[PDB]
Amino acid sequence: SLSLWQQCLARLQDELPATEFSMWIRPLQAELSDNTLALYAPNRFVLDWVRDKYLNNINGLLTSFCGADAPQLRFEVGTKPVTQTPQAAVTSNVAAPAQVAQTQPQR
């Protein structure tokens, strides 16, 4: 019924008139990990900012809710990066030893 993010928002808007959070969260995408509220922003700037105020607020609530269950928060820039490149290699080897020959008889 209720989601961490949602609560975090209302809590921040209820704790104080600070509506800024609504600007540094609306365009962002929060992710619940059953105990970790991540935040997806278009850049790192927003993250630092949000983690500056939002964090404090959220944390206070997480503990104020239960304390022994107070989860954590995460921050990142959009979705993870992408990878895709070729691969190859080459090797070699050369050799050609020898062995002297002699008997050296006696008398």
Two tokens, residue 19: 């509506």
Residues 14 and 6: their CA atoms lie apart, in Å, by 12
How far, in Å, CA of 107 to CA of 6, rounded? Answer: 107
Record the tokens describing residue 52, joined without a space.
Answer: 């500056």
Domain boundaries, the chain: 1-107
Q: Which two tokens stand for residue 68?
A: 């022994």
Helix, strand or coil, per DSSP, at residue 55: helix
Question: Which residues touch 34 (CB under 8 Å, ≥6 apart)?
Answer: 71
- For residues 51 and 30, the answer to whether their CB atoms sit within 8 Å is no
Experimental method: NMR
Domain covering 1-107, topology = GMP Synthetase; Chain A, domain 3 (3.30.300)
Q: Which residue has the tokens 């030893």?
A: 97
